[PDB]
């Protein structure tokens, strides 16, 4: 499927929404960075 939400992912194509990306997090970790207009 497709992850959310500063959830952990690899590919950008792992993140769900319309234009979403995956990048890093903050503990070097790496998250997604949808952009879903709701929430």
């Given at each position: 499927g497709c992850k959310g939400q500063d959830a952990p992912c690899s590919?950008?194509?792992?993140c769900c929404g319309e234009a979403s990306m995956c990048s890093k997090g903050a503990d070097g970790k790496k998250t997604c960075m949808i952009d879903k207009l709701w929430g």
């Open positions: 590919k950008s194509k792992d």
